[PDB]
Amino acid sequence: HMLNICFVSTEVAPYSKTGGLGDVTEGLPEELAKIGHKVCTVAPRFDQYEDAWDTEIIQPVNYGQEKTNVRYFHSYKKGVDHIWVDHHVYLSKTPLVNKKLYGPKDSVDYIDNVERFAMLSQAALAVPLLVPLGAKGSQGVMGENTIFVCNDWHTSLLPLYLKEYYQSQGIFVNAKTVMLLHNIAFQGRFPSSKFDALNLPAKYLSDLSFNTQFAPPPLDEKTTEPITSPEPMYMLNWLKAGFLNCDQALTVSPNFAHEVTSSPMGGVELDAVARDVGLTGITNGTKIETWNPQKDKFILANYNSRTINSGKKLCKVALQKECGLTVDPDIPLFGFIGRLENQKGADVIIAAMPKLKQLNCQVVILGIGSPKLEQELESVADKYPFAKGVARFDSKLAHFITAGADYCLMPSRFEPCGLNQLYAMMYGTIPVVAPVGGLVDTVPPQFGFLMNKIPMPKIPGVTVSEELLQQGVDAMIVGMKKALQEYGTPKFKKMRLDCMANDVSWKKPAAKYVDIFEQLVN
Ligand SMILES: C[C@H]1O[C@H](O[C@H]2[C@H](O)[C@@H](O)[C@@H](O[C@H]3[C@H](O)[C@@H](O)[C@H](O)O[C@@H]3CO)O[C@@H]2CO)[C@H](O)[C@@H](O)[C@@H]1N[C@H]1C=C(CO)[C@@H](O)[C@H](O)[C@H]1O
Ligand SMILES: Nc1ncnc2c1ncn2[C@@H]1O[C@H](COP(=O)(O)OP(=O)(O)O)[C@@H](O)[C@H]1O
Numbered sequence: 001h002m003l004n005i006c007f008v009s010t011e012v013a014p015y016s017k018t019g020g021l022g023d024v025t026e027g028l029p030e031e032l033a034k035i036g037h038k039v040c041t042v043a044p045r046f047d048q049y050e051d052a053w054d055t056e057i058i059q060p061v062n063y064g065q066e067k068t069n070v071r072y073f074h075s076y077k078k079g080v081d082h083i084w085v086d087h088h089v090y091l092s093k094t095p096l097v098n099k100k101l102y103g104p105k106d107s108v109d110y111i112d113n114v115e116r117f118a119m120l121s122q123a124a125l126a127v128p129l130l131v132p133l134g135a136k137g138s139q140g141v142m143g144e145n146t147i148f149v150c151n152d153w154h155t156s157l158l159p160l161y162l163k164e165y166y167q168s169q170g171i172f173v174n175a176k177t178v179m180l181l182h183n184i185a186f187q188g189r190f191p192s193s194k195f196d197a198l199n200l201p202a203k204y205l206s207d208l209s210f211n212t213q214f215a216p217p218p219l220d221e222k223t224t225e226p227i228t229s230p231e232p233m234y235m236l237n238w239l240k241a242g243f244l245n246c247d248q249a250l251t252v253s254p255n256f257a258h259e260v261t262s263s264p265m266g267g268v269e270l271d272a273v274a275r276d277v278g279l280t281g282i283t284n285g286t287k288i289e290t291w292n293p294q295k296d297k298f299i300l301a302n303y304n305s306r307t308i309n310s311g312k313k314l315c316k317v318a319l320q321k322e323c324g325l326t327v328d329p330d331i332p333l334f335g336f337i338g339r340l341e342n343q344k345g346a347d348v349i350i351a352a353m354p355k356l357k358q359l360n361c362q363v364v365i366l367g368i369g370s371p372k373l374e375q376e377l378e379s380v381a382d383k384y385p386f387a388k389g390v391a392r393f394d395s396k397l398a399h400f401i402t403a404g405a406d407y408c409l410m411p412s413r414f415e416p417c418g419l420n421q422l423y424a425m426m427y428g429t430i431p432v433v434a435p436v437g438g439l440v441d442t443v444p445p446q447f448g449f450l451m452n453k454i455p456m457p458k459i460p461g462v463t464v465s466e467e468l469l470q471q472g473v474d475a476m477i478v479g480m481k482k483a484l485q486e487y488g489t490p491k492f493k494k495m496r497l498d499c500m501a502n503d504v505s506w507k508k509p510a511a512k513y514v515d516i517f518e519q520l521v522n
Contacts, residue, residue, distance in 0.1 A: 002036060002037055002038055003032075003037040003038065003147065003514070003517050003518070003521070004037070004038050004128070004142045004143065004145055004146045004147065005029070005032060005037055005038070005039045005040075005146070005147050005149060005517065006039075006040050006041075006042060006124070006127060006128055006142060006146050006147065006148050006149065007025055007028075007029055007039070007040070007041040007042070007149045007151065008041075008042045008043070008120070008121070008124040008148060008149065008150050008151060008155045008158060009021060009022075009025045009041065009042075009043050009151035009152065009154070009155060010043060010044060010101060010102075010117070010120070010151075010152070010154045010155075011025060011043065011101070011151075012025045012026060012041050012043045012082060013025070013026040014026070015043075015046075015047070015049050015082070015084075015098070016043060016044075016046050016047075016098055016101060017098065018101055018102070019339065020182065020284070020417070020418075020419045021151060021152060021182050021183075023286065023287070023419055024151075024182065024252070024284055025041055025043075025151060026287065027285065027286060027287040027506050028284075028285075028506055028509075028510060028513065029041055029080045030078050030079065030080055030287070030506070031285075031505075031506035031507065031510040032510055032513070032514070033078065033079035033080050034079065035510065035511075035514065037514070038133070038139075038142060039079070039080050039081070040080065040081035040082070040083055040127065040128075040131075040133060040142065041080065041081070041082050041083065042083045042084075042085065042120075042123070042124040042127050043082070043083075043084060043085070043120075044084065044085050044087075044090040044116075044120055045073055045084035045085060045086040045087075045090055045091060046090055046091065046093075046098065046101060047091070047097050047098065048091070049073070049075060049084065051075040051077070052073040052074060052075040052082070052084055053073060053074055053075070054071060054072075054073055054086075055071075055072045055073065055074050055131055055132075055137070056071075057071065057072045057130050057131060058070070058071055059072070059123060059126045059130065061119050061122040061123050062118070062119065062122060062199045063087075063089065063115050063116075063119050064112075064114070064115040064118075064196075064197040065196060065197060065199070068087070068119075069087075070085050070086060070087050070119070070123045071086040071087075072084065072085065072086065072123075072127065072130070072131055073086055074131060074137065076133075076134065076135055076136075081131075081133045081134070083127050083131055085119075085120060085123040085124070087119070089112065089115070089116055089119075090116070093110070103221070104221065105222070105224070106369055106370060106371075107217070107224050108217070108221060108222060108223075108224060109216070109217075109219070109221070110221060111219045111220065111221045114190055114194045114197050114198070115197055117154045117155070117157075117188075118157055118197065118198055118199075120154065120155065121150075121155055121156075121157045121158040121161055122161055122165070124148070124155070124158060125148075125158065125161055125162060125165070125166060125172075127142070128141060128142035128143060128144070128146045128172075128175075129141060129143075129144070129171075144171065144172050144173070144174065144175060145174055145175065145521070146172070146175045146176075147175070147176045147177070147178060147517055147520060147521065148162065148175065148176070148177045148178070149177075149178045149180050150177060150178065150179050150180065150242060150246070151180050151182060152180070152181065152182050152183065152186070152239075153186055153187050153188035153238050153239040153242070154188070155242075156179060156188060156238045156239045156241065156242025156243075157188075157198065157200075157238055157241065157242065158177060158242075159177040159179070159241075159242055159245035159246045159247075160200055160204050160207070160241060160242075160245050161200075162175065162177060163245065164200060164201065164204070174521070176247045176248075176517075176520045176521060177245070177246045177247050177248075178246060178247065178248050178249075178250060178516075178517075178520070179239075179242045179243055179246040179248070179249045179250065180250050180251070180252075181239075181249065181250065181251040181252070181260075181279070181416075182251070182252055182416055182417075183416055184239075184260055184267060184268045184270060184416070185268055185343070185414070186239075187237050187238065187239040187240065187268070187270065188236075188237060188238025188239050189210065189212075189215060189216055189235055189236065189237050189238075190219075190235065190236045190238070191215075191219070191235055191236070192209075192234055192235055192236055194219075194236065195208070195236060204241065204245075207240065207241040207244045207245060208236045208237065208238070208240070208241045209234070209236070209237075210234070210235050210236060210237035210240055211232045211233070211234055211235075212232055212233070212235070212269055213228060213229045213230070213231070213232050213233070213459075214226065214227075214228060214229075214269075214459070214460050214461065215227040215228075215229070215233065215235060225461070226460065226461035228459060228460075228461055228462070237270075239270065240270060240273050243270065243273050243274065243277045244273065244276075244277065246277075247520055248278075248280075248516065248520060249274065249277050249278065249279045249280075250279070250280050250281070250282060250513075250516065251279055251280070251281045251282075251416065252281065252282065252283070252284050252416045252417040252438060253281045253282070253283045253284070253416060253417045253437055253438025253441045253442070254280075254281035254282070254283065254441055255281065255437055255438060255440045255441045256281055256415075256416045256417065256437040256438050257274075257279045257280055257281030258281070259414075259436070259437060260274045260279055261274045261275045261279055265456070266414075280516070281438075281441075282509050282512045282513060282516075283417060283438055283441050283442060283509055284417045284419065284422070284438070284509065285422070285504055285505050285506035285507065285508065285509045285510070286419060286422045286423065286426075286504055286505065286506070287505075287506070288426070288505060291402070291423045291426060291427075292426050292427075293308075293311065293312070293403060293426070293427045293428070293500075296399060296403065298395070298396045298399035298400065299315050299318070299399050299400060299403045299404075300314055300315060300318040301314040301315055301318075303315075304500075305428070305497055305500045305501065308428050308496060308497070308500070312403065312404075312427075312428060313329045315400070315403040315404040316329050316333065316404045316405075316406070317329055317404075318400060318404060319333065319335075319364065319400045319401060319403075319404025319405065320333070320362070320404070322397070322400055323364050323388040323390075324381065324388060325362050325364075325385075325386065325388060326362075326385075326386075330488070331360065331361065331362055332360075332361045332362070332406050332407065332483075332484055332487045332488075333361065333362040333363075333364065333404065333405045333406050333407070334361060334362065334363045334364070334405060334406070334407045334408075334409040334432070334480065335363075335364045335365075335366075335401035335402065335404070335405030335407065335408055335409060335429070336349055336363070336364070336365045336366065336367070336408075336409045336410070336411075337366045337367065337398050337401055337402070337420055338366075338367050338410070338420065339367060339368070339369050340367040340368060340369030340370055340373040340374060340377065340391075341369045341370070342413060342457065342464070343412060343413055343414060343415070344367070344410070344411070344412055344413075345410075345411035345412055345413055345434065345454050345472060345476070346365065346367055346369075346373060346377070347373065347464070347469065348411045348454060348469065348472040348473055348476055349363065349365055349409070349411060349476070350365075350373075350376055350377065350380060350389075351469050351470070351472075351473050352473040352476060352477060353380065353383065353384045353387060355473060355477060356384070356386070356387070356477075357384070357386065359477070359480060359481070359484060361386065361480070361484065362386050362387065363386065363387040363388070363409070364387070364388050364390075364401055364405065365377060365380070365387070365388070365389045365390070366389075366390050366392070366394065366397055366398060366401060367390075367391065368391055368392065368393055374391035375391075376389075377389035377390070377391045378390070378391050402420075402423050402424055402427050402429060403427050403429070405424075405429050406429065406430065406487065407429065407430050407431070407432050407480075407483055408420055408421055408423075408424035408429050408430065408431045408432065408433075408448075409432050409433075409476075409480070410431065410432070410433040410434060410439065411433075411434050411451060411454050411472065411475075411476045412433070412434045412436055412437075412439065412454065413434070413436070413454045413455075413456050413472075414436050414437055414456070415433075415434065415436050415437040415438060415439050416437050416438060417437065417438035417441075417442070418433070418437070418438055418439055418442065421433055421439065421442055421443055421448070422442065422504040424499075425447060425448075425499040425500070425502050425504060426499075426500065426502075426504065427500075428496035428497070428499050428500045429496075429499070430447070430448045430449070430483065430492075430495055430496065430499060431443045431447065431448035431449070432448060432449045432450075432451065432479050432480055432482075432483045433448065433449075433450060433451065433479070434450070434451050434453065434454050434475075434476075434479075435450045435451065435452070435453060436453070436454075442504075446495070446498050447495065447498060447499050447502060448483075448495070448499070449479050449482045449483045450479055450482075451475050451476050451478055451479030451480075452474070452475035452476075452478045452479065453475055454472040454475055454476065455468045455471050455472055455475070456468075
């Protein structure tokens with residue numbers, strides 16, 4: 001019958017979000033509540049969310065070696081309890097709303113992320129014991145028969161604290177932990193000198209231990225250059241410890257799970273740990289409410305599969321005009337939306353421009369990240385009239401692109417699942433994607449086209465060489481040409497309808513989570 005599920009993360013859309021993590025922790029818990037399970041999320045109170053009330057509960061926790069208290073705020077929406085951990089170090093980092101969750105600059109992290117996120121894991125464990133759930137806390141607390149779902153490296157110490165602080169005294173004796181991995185590139189690698197700040201005994205030292213040549217940039221809150229080394233140096237790795245201490249490790253697509261366990265490249269050095277522990281993938285779904293052509297509240301014309309020829313053409317012409325491009329619904333249009341970071345291959349699209357004019361297509365690119373990627377992005381229209389770059393976070397334009405574009409272009413170098421392609425398919429927009437991770441799972445040949453592989457930099461941190469960049473360009477264009485060969489044909493029309501008929505909701509994947517959860521507690 002009824003499961004008790006407590007999701008712990010740094011992000012819960014629409015309150016806090018830097019990407020897909022927030023969308024999953026919004027959508028999956030809502031679907032689980034819909035099925036009838038008791039579900040809550042726990043995350044930091046980064047802003048004074050209007051629908052959240054102070055519960056008046058205070059809980060002592062450690063902020064590094066300092067003893068401190070958190071307060072818990074509580075909101076309730078669509079059958080899900082959202083618990084927010086309140087502390088000066090979460091709220092007062094910036095007056096700006098839903099910005100700078102992980103650091104002040106783009107790639108730069110707060111020095112004190114160790115203390116901040118260790119404190120989150122400690123604070124979350126008390127929630128099932130203390131916070132009354134339901135509409136206005138009428139349902140009482142979740143209790144000890146709880147499954148903690150730890151999302152990504154930020155919460156990966158929770159299983160250690162569960163054992164050390166609770167189960168060692170006979171509390172939560174039957175509670176379970178699930179490590180839900182969204183992205184293996186970030187693992188909570190910290191210097192070993194930060195061990196004392198965790199307030200854990202030495203019995204967990206071996207699980208935390210790690211050797212590598214690739215450290216993140218040093219904890220000085222400005223330096224952006226990662227520390228590569230000729231020698232392999234000793235450090236801590238939170239995600240490793242999380243894998244070794246959880247009851248089960250999951251991730252966000254079967255093919256990504258395969259990649260992680262199959263090689264040091266795919267698992268970013270945690271492949272053997274993932275193999276040892278076992279790692280299963282479940283492809284993300286998505287919510288339909290905000291993203292569907294029938295009810296979309298931003299685009300110029302709503303449509304469904306029957307009226308796609310009318311409404312989508314109008315959206316296309318609207319996108320074209322909005323971007324300063326020649327208005328003509330017969331020119332195939334490619335749209336990119338994503339972080340301007342190595343993972344997503346925005347640098348490949350920009351570098352591909354000289355070769356792209358030959359294809360007789362339009363390209364629209366929307367993203368934020370590196371100052372000089374953003375500067376390059378905005379300059380693209382000058383040299384290339386068929387293309388347009390916009391360096392902003394802009395939901396309205398994202399909606400215009402998803403509806404108006406013929407193709408959704410994702411030249412990712414790695415992609416645990418991806419969300420753009422799911423949205424795109426619901427709008428009848430055809431994905432053209434890199435053959436990596438969950439893009440392989442979500443875009444079979446009936447729905448879209450695969451590129452050749454976009455090659456990674458020879459080592460992390462190292463800016464990709466002009467050599468490998470150009471291989472990516474060629475690899476992307478192979479995929480685009482495959483797609484353009486069918487553009488405008490009866491097969492094109494059919495592929496759009498097949499995309500729109502493709503069910504990408506949380507219904508099926510949520511059911512798979514429930515099966516895994518039921519096995520853990522029985
Ligand atoms: C979009 C992405 O958001 C989250 O990733 C965070 C990192 O967790 C956080 O540490 C920070 O990363 C910086 C890092 O700390 C720093 O040392 C390094 O030099 O620069 C990094 C900045 O790029 O910020 C990022 C971005 O906000 C989540 O942890 C990720 O899971 C999430 N992406 C995932 C999520 C999903 C949803 O399931 C997948 O669909 C998607 O394929 C995958 O990319
Ligand atoms: N500049 C932007 N403006 C608006 N939305 C964006 C922008 N960049 C990314 N997004 C949205 O953020 C989400 C990113 O999710 P996903 O595709 O899983 O990539 P990530 O790896 O960043 O999580 C998508 O839903 C995408 O539509």
